[model samples]
Structure formats: C-alpha cells, structure tokens
Target: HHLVPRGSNPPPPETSNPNKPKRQTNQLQYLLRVVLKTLWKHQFAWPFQQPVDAVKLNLPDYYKIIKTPMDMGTIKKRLENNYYWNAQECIQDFNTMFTNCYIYNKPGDDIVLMAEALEKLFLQKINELPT
Candidate 1:
C-alpha cells in the first residue's frame, strides 16, 4: 500500500472540491486526533495555558511561514474529516511551531517523539486486525 503521499505539495483537503463528499473520520483517525490533543497539552516543559488562537499570535515569522497563519484551524478541520494521511508532515510542522514559540534547546522534541510513538502504536493496532 502506498501510504506516503506523492509529490512535494501538501495534499489539498477533500472540501477543496465542492462536488466531492467530505471524508469521514475512521476509528484510527479519531484516536489519532484525540491522542494528539492530549499529547500536545502537556508535551512542553512550559505548557501553553492560552488557547491556540491566542498563542498563535506570538509565533515568529519563520514559524508562521512554516505552519501558515491558519494552519491550526485547517488541522482540526482536516482531522475532523479524516484527511490526515500526511501525519509525519503535520507532526514536523507542529514540531517547528512549538520549537519556535518556546525557549529551550530541543524544544518540541517531546511532541515529535509522542507523535511517532502514537503513530507506531496505531499501526500496531491495525496490524493486529484480521487480514
């Protein structure tokens, strides 16, 4: 199975097409979103107390460019619709965002590690299913 997306461009959301049906979240996707939210909450040494909308305003120029200004909303919407095959890319983006926003060496390392661990666990769960 070709899980990795093709090309360098990010995959456009299904909603980008007016005629296409919106993708629905499967169990794994649901779990992924839930796990990400929880992991993100406590992944930092100094956690963000404010909502993302407020915190995002403090992101540096490079971080804004890497994640795009509207990325958090886009990510939530994409997760709601199960358009999350670009898991690694999204994790890297978050890693960049957090690293830029926070002060510390190895900032966002925990976020990346948690993302990888969760992804691996999810894959294992899938593999245990009857083929």
Candidate 2:
C-alpha cells in the first residue's frame, strides 16, 4: 500500500485551517526535539502526553503534531503480539524516532545551531519533570 502522503505536502489537520508558517518556529522545533528525546530515553513511550491546553497557544492538533501517523490500537496489538514487556523494546523504539531528526540537518547551514538550541530546551523539560 503506497500510503505516502499522496504528494509532498501533508493533508491539513482536521481541526482549524491553520495558515501556519511552513517554516517551523524555534519553539515548535524545540518541542519536537524534546518529544524525540523523551521517547528515545524510554522506548515504550506510547500514548503521548497530550497537552490539553495547547490549543490556547495556537498549536496544531495532535494529529498534526506527530511526525508520523500511528494507531494506538495497533501499537497495543504489537506489544501484545511480541510480548514486549522488556525495557529494551521501548528504548529501541524511542531511538528510532530520535534518529529521524538528523534528516533535518543540512550542510553549511544553521541546522546544527538550531538543533543545539532545541536540545537545551529538551533537556530543560526533562530536568523539570519529576522522575
């Protein structure tokens, strides 16, 4: 099944018609980095922490927030099918997502600078959370 996004651009969110900038904001990029890192830190990072009040900040809907579409039920089934009760599965899954960010890096550009800024932000969030 060629479920590729039909074309280059994604199908717009089911919620508000966001005329949102195609260029990602520092805040948004940082948020993504944090999510990636947290998932990378723990492989079984399923059922993401949905920010209920994020609508106030004019953020995109949850469906738009994710880099890829994943079915919660399917994930659950996979976990069950493989008996993925071990810590290793979660760590590996998180790494898969974390690795995706490297594609965002471009040569001789400010990509690394931006990534560093985002990485710091991600670390701050991890520090703030009670673990």
Candidate 3:
C-alpha cells in the first residue's frame, strides 16, 4: 500500500528574481510585499468592512482611466460589481491593478504613486478589520 497519498500536492514552483530593469523590479517587489502582508492581516474584514480609498491619491490620473478622483464609493461599486468563486476576487483585483501599473512602467511617478497609494489602502484595510 502506498504510505502517502498520490498527487497530494506538488511542491510550489521556485520563485525567481525579477529580470530586466532591476530598479523597477525592486520597487515592484517591495510594494507587492507590503500590499500582500496588509491584505493577509485583514483577510476576514477586507472589502466588507473597510473601503479601499487609497487609489484616489493619484492612481486615477496615473492610469488615465478617468479624470475624476477615485473614492470609496467607486471602489465599493467595483468590488461588488463582480461575482467570484471566493473572497480572493477583491484581492486579485487589487494585485492586478497595482502590479499592472508597476510592471508596465508607464512613465512618470507611476510607481511611486502606486506604492504610496497601496500603502495607504493597505493600512486602511487592516485598520478596519472586524474584531
């Protein structure tokens, strides 16, 4: 009899260093780390209790999606607009929006702006977790 279950799980793929532009990669890694850590701390109450309001800080203009400012209501609407298999939907959205901006390096202070916005949003997300 097999002692262990077959295909129980495969080892996770090894993480590799980001290649190409090291500065952008470095900025991306640091920003992503903070964003994820904050999300984990408030995994339960995120998007439900707290609002993602940091994107208002210049991210809107950076992405050039809309000339209007981003607000809590805007983010809330986006979060609720989609159905998902799990809570990770909001998380994935957050990651994609932030990472896409950084990875693409859209010129100007986009990276710094995003990093700051994410830091603010992460703090807000963590602070509002239901006790």
Predicted model with the maximum TM-score: 1
Off by over 4 Å in 2: 1-7, 12-99
TM-score of each: 0.35, 0.28, 0.32
Model 1 Cα lDDT, one tens digit per residue, 1-131: 33642213233323233454654434436435554455435434223322233223432232233343223334455455555454554455444434434332244566445445544543454443222
90 in model 3: Cα distance from truth in Å? 0.5
Candidate 3 residue-wise lDDT, 1-131, digit = tens:
54533222223222232342222233233324443455435433233222223344322233343222222223343433322223344444554444544543454664546445654676565444332
Residues 3-108, candidate 2: write the lDDT tens digits: 4332232442132224533342333333234544453344333322221222443323433444653322322333334323333443344333333233333444
List of clashing residue pairs for candidate 3: none
Q: Residue 53 deviation, candidate 2, in Å? A: 25
Ordered from best to worst TM-score, the candidate numbers read: 1, 3, 2
- Candidate 1 lDDT for residue 64: 31
lDDT, model 2, position 56: 41
Task: Write down the worst ten-residue block by lDDT for model 1.
Answer: 45-54
Every candidate's lDDT: 0.41, 0.36, 0.39
